[PDB]
Design a protein around this ligand. Structure first.
Ligand code: HEM
Ligand SMILES: *[C@@H]1O[C@H](CO)[C@@H](O[C@@H]2O[C@H](CO)[C@@H](O)[C@H](O)[C@H]2NC(C)=O)[C@H](O)[C@H]1NC(C)=O
Ligand SMILES: *[C@H]1O[C@H](CO)[C@@H](O)[C@H](O)[C@@H]1O
Ligand SMILES: [Ca+2]
Ligand SMILES: [Ca+2]
Length: 357
């Protein structure tokens, strides 16, 4: 089909996603892997994962736009703290781009957001999810204080995800920060490169923790290897769940296996996201609109490296059967600040709409 803008695409039903991508980029992401992009990526997961094989369809419909269509229900669950901003940012697009279901909007917006993160894959994007659903029930969203048994079971019950697929999906913590875990600090990144879809999170969670970016007593948090912050440049935070996954016998080798393995990580993330994005649907009933996902920014191709103030002597290794790679260390005696903005500048406020969530 040829779309009104002249773009030739696979299927006529994919045309409306072209102006949606442009609007999302111009309005909320600015082609950056920044605050608003991160928030949308998280929303893609919280929308999709609220489904349960065991509980049946009344517990939730998966990747169904329930977050947008019932903005006063799930976003107010404690496990969804902070999801409100992303919901409020996407509702105006749902209202304007009113040929595209809320469910499809969520998944597409995440694909567009991810495309702004150097190294990310170009997600598969299938379209045609209905615009009607139910609000999900509480308890379906993994929380950082949860055990590996509980996490793995939650993902198995949501969609048959394997441990490999779970850890693959956690590549998203390469482009992720926390506002709610610690009340006293904002935007605490989970790796030293929160604007770059690289393997640094996998490396950095394996380092010995030496302090906290904020306070020491938060649920779901453990000591960080890079806790130094100053001004807007908050120190790295470590989630208990990521730590636990990195060390548990079920997942330690998978976790380590992504260190310095960018292409492997990105491909594995793509495959798991292909499954996540269609929870609640038969994929054989959705049309393939992958060709209207923007082309992602490429990695530079550089290997993972130990951040300054860390090195191999700081590793806490847990995979007996796989050799930990040889990596360089960035020079310097003390920790570098992790920039708050994609350009290293002093100001980069994200666009935010008010709304019902
Ligand atoms: C065991 C599973 C997981 C747990 C326990 C978990 C937990 C968390 C927590 C606690 C935060 C910080 C929220 C805040 O305080 O502001 C966060 C952020 C984030 N998570 Fe996860 N997460 C998990 C899986 C995922 C997956 C599967 C994805 C997507 C594929 C995802 C994407 C993100 C993103 C992009 C952010 C950053 C949001 C921002 O910077 O605004 N997470 N996660
Ligand atoms: C999907 O459902 C939503 C929610 O009902 C629809 O949103 C409405 O969109 C119209 C414009 O078409 C606006 O006038 C309303 O204000 C919106 N309602 C709400 C509650 O925000 C949306 O149009 C539907 N989309 C599709 C593809 O059917
Ligand atoms: C980042 O900053 C630290 C200092 O805070 C250095 O040690 C490192 O070399 C890099 O310049
Ligand atoms: Ca949902
Ligand atoms: Ca990163």
């Amino acid at each position: 089909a040829v779309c009104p803008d002249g773009t030739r695409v696979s299927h006529a039903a994919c045309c409306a996603f072209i102006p949606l991508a442009q609007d999302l980029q111009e309005t909320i992401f600015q082609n950056e892997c920044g605050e608003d992009a991160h928030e949308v990526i998280r929303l893609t997961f919280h929308d999709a994962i609220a489904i349960s094989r065991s509980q049946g369809p009344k517990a939730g419909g998966g990747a169904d736009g329930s977050m947008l269509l019932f903005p006063t229900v799930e976003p107010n669950f404690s496990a969804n703290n902070g999801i409100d901003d992303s919901v409020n940012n996407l509702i105006p697009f749902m209202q304007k781009h009113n040929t595209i279901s809320a469910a499809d909007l969520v998944q597409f917006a995440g694909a567009v957001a991810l495309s702004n993160c150097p190294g990310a894959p170009r997600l598969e994007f299938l379209a045609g999810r209905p615009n009607k659903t139910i609000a999900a029930v509480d308890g379906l969203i993994p929380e950082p204080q949860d055990s590996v048994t509980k996490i793995l079971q939650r993902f198995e019950d949501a969609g048959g995800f394997t441990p490999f697929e779970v850890v693959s999906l956690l590549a998203s913590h390469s482009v992720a920060r926390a506002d709610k875990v610690d009340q006293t600090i904002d935007a605490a990144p989970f790796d030293s490169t929160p604007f770059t879809f690289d393997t640094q999170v996998f490396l950095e969670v394996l380092l010995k923790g030496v302090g906290f970016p904020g306070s020491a007593n938060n649920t779901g948090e453990v000591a960080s290897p890079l806790p130094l912050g100053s001004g807007s440049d908050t120190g790295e935070m470590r989630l208990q769940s990521d730590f636990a996954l990195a060390h548990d016998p079920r997942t330690a080798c998978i976790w380590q296996g992504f260190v310095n393995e960018q292409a492997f990580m990105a491909a594995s993330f793509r495959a798991a996201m292909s499954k996540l994005a269609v929870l609640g649907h038969n994929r054989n009933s959705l049309i393939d609109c992958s060709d209207v996902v923007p082309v992602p920014k490429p990695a530079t191709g550089q290997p993972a490296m130990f951040p300054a103030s860390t090195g191999p002597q700081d590793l806490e290794l847990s995979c007996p059967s796989e050799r930990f790679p040889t990596l360089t260390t960035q020079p310097g005696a003390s920790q570098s600040l992790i920039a708050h903005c994609p350009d290293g500048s002093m100001s980069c406020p994200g666009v935010q709409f008010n709304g019902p969530a």
